[PDB]
Design a protein around this nucleic acid. Sequence first.
RNA 1: AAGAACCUUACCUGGUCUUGACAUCCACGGAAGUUUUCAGAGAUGAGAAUGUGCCUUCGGGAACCGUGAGACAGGUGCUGCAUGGCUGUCGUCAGCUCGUGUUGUGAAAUGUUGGGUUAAGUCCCGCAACGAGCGCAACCCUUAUCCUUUGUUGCCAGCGGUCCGGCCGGGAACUCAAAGGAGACUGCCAGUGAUAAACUGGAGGAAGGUGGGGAUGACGUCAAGUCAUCAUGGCCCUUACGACCAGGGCUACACACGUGCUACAAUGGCGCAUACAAAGAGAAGCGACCUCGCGAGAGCAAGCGGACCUCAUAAAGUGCGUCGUAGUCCGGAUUGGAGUCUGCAACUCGACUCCAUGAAGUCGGAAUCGCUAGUAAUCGUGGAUCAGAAUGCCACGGUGAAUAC
Lengths: 151, 96, 112, 127, 206, 98
Amino acid sequence: PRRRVIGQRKILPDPKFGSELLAKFVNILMVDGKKSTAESIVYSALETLAQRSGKSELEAFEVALENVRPTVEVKSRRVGGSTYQVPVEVRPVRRNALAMRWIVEAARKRGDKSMALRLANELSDAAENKGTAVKKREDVHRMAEANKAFA
Amino acid sequence: AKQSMKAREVKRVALADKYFAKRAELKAIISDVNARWNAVLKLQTLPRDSSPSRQRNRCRQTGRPHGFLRKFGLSRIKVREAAMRGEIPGLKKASW
Amino acid sequence: KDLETQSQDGTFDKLTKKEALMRTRELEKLENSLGGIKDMGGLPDALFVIDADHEHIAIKEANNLGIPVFAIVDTNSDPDGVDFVIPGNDDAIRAVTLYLGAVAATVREGRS
Amino acid sequence: NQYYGTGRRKSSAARVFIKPGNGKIVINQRSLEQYFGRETARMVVRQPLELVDMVEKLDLYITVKGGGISGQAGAIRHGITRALMEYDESLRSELRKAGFVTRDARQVERKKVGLRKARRRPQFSKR
Amino acid sequence: GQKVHPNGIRLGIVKPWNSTWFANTKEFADNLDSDFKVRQYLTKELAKASVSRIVIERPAKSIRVTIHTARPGIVIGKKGEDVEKLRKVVADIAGVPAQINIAEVRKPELDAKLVADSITSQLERRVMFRRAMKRAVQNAMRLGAKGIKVEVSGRLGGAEIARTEWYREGRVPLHTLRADIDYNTSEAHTTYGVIGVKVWIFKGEI
Amino acid sequence: RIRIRLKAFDHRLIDQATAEIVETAKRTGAQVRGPIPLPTRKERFTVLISPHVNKDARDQYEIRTHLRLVDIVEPTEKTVDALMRLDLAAGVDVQISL
RNA sequence: AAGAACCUUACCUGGUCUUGACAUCCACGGAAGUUUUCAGAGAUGAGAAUGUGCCUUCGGGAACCGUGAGACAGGUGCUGCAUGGCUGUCGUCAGCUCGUGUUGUGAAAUGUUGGGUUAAGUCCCGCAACGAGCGCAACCCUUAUCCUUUGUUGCCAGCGGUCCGGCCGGGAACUCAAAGGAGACUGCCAGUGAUAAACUGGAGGAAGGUGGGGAUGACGUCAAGUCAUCAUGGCCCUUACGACCAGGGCUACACACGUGCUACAAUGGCGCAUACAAAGAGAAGCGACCUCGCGAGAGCAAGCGGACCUCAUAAAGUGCGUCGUAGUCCGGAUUGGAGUCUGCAACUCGACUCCAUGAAGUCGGAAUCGCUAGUAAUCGUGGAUCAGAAUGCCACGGUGAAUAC
């Protein structure tokens, strides 16, 4: 964790869309190595969000990603016994991954009977910054604005 | 290494074939459901110990019952003792 | 010497490059430090030092064993370890090179 | 005629032998549908065919042995890529450049004594 | 105890087996016990022979029993005065018609078994250990042996303090797979406990 | 006809034993389909190396078993008769099916 | 311990004996079928030989017992602190040392310390050091690439006979089935580099930077397990601290702990047109013909030490709809009612089917541990007992998740 390098790894996308972004979404939506049902629910969610939004599905997807987008964060170091953190602009790849996982966890925060219905409804109401994960984005923003007093 | 133990085992395996393979055959002949009557139940003069199925067939080198091995008829420690001395063809260290 | 004689007849390359690499890269590296002593087979009769203080090891071994010394001394050396002295300067590299040439010439002439 | 292809990938090899005819794929004397192909990797078999032209160049009979489904798809892809190079190396340059001939040696690691799985040991005992 | 058995890994690479035959696994045990019994019989009746080892070969309803003994003084005898008697008793105890063949081995001191047993013998014969290993190593080295090693641990000359000693000279590439190695362990029976010996030899690299 | 099967655990020994017999029949025979590799047996025998607890310390033992076939089709009866009484394989048995 | 009612076994209950449990030069014989008799939980008993293998004066016995006497112990006690064989600890840690020579009156350093470095005492430069072992490196398997011999108890493209008889003439482009040869060694260029070693790319990535995995575990610390495996050191129990026959202990149970398994649902019990597994065991054994069993399976059950004859059917899914929110159609820990193979029979006590049985649990105290690419997890197979079933233990083929500033 101190000598290794980063190779910018990439794994199997969905051939219909063929986008690395959608590739990473579907590949992190995977659980325990599940392909058929996971991709089926992914496409169900995509078609349902397109139906409810009415606009183009891909641009609605981009608008949702922009809505969930956070800006800054800090890292815990425990230097002087009090909160002594240097606000570091998180990596664009890491920022994107964290936004992905916040969306996935916002989806995960329910226990609904039907995974497809729950996923579609929550992502659709989160597409216009009024769903579930935007509260987490606001909470993370509130975690900022105060860690710059110590640098 | 109990020598009375080894004597019992040797005599029981000696009687595990001369007193067997015919009493069990007689039982199997009279074990048929068609009438089996009290003859099979009254023919229990067998000690039921000489039967190989209910006989341990212990290792016969140092009398350690643990690690009985059908392939060699030995115990683990003596298999290590003798195989490493060679003299057992075909046995090489395994890796893959 | 046995290793180099075997290497001119031995295997060229086998598996890892280390076993053959150690065979040849060290040849000229330690050969230069050995020079031509293979032809010597004995004990020297004289010695030479370009700076007595810096290379006093050879003179110390010499007077420990008893080899006469013909060295060059200058203003910063320690000439107490030398009795047969040739005063000179350590900066004059051309002069000492011609000095070595002249002494080699008079040795090769000698009485022969 | 035939095209040379064996396609070794993830313990799966497929004898891709292409003859003139239709672009349809016959798997185990059967089509992909009644082979029940709406399972995993339902569309990856046509990704190698997605970019290249189909026209009337490929008709093949295929048998696949070993692996699950990703093994089957990898065997198909490797075999067809091995059979594809009949058209000189001009295609193979971009075939490699796009990773179409990707062969991965990520086979299974043997189970190890003392560990109940590939890399999991007993939970560390009490201090 | 951490060191691995030396010839154990060697056997599967370059060293021939101590026996080479085939029988089904159930009677394989009987064959192995017959081999053990003939080993005990041969090493007890020929205690004066100081045999290096005995190799068993089992053909169909027969056995060869090749023997490598240091000196042929009693191995052959007077043109078959006793060898046929040994053949007869071996065949009778083993229950199979057996033949016996004889071969000779050079340089008895290069044998690990012979030197170890000899060292145990002088230690039984009230002499100092130091001279024992030193004489052994000097005699073995001068005979063209490129490298050897000895080890004695236990009681040293009657001292009751713990004693563990080893001594080596020459090349011993023990952790190299293609190194010829001879290994043995013998025992002594001095009055104050058993003395354990150990020895390693090396002869060739390829 | 009259194929010959050998069951050995030494690859060089079985190779030489099948490279002698094939020309033993080829002294006055002909044809022969050719050498075949045949499958092999594999068994991993494990045993507790230590005599006292500590199951983790073990070791792996295996025994090989090679098989060789020739599949002569049309030989002459003379050499196939001469096969017997010339057995030289010591410690390894040959398998023949009538 | 890869293992228990009976032997195991050494603990108990019910009942008796030491030249002994069992091995001798043996002292005399029947030359070791043990026949019927029943009692008795039982080494409890004891009773006639009907057969007479060896022979050259059965001129030696019986290899077994019938008699108490010249093979000797049955050990379950110390001693690892006297120990030899044996295994674990640090630890795949990067060190431990030696011969020549020197400084120093001397205990000893010196080589093994300085800079660049690398998985590393792996290298290179400088210096009173030069060299050498014990180690890592390499010498072995396996797979990822290509080759020649290679086709059966055959995997088929081929012309056709096909009901999908590879039987013909079979072939190489066949994974497959084992012997051998190449493949990679930082090649060669460009950069950072003292011109040193190393670190960044390109025809190679079908394999590039020890290709990835396994065995290979240096002197030594642990008074650790092994005189119960074993040979003893100083000794020892002694009608034996043994011989036995049946029922019983490790499966049980009012204590704290740990490892492992289905659980907290709507992806689990649902039925249907229903697809591809490498890879083993197999003769006190594997058992294709038919029939039925809410079932364990019940009987004729062929062929076979093997590509012959048992488990390839793989689950991983298309769509019908459900519990469409909770103790819920989730969750199936209990006592008795009929069986599968059980040894002689299942009683702390063989494991499996059909029910009356779904209690507690709606993802979890202050948390720790294992885990940097086929890897953590999610499904499905062989081995050990085998008179008998595996949550586990020893090995397999699937689907596969990044945080390493």
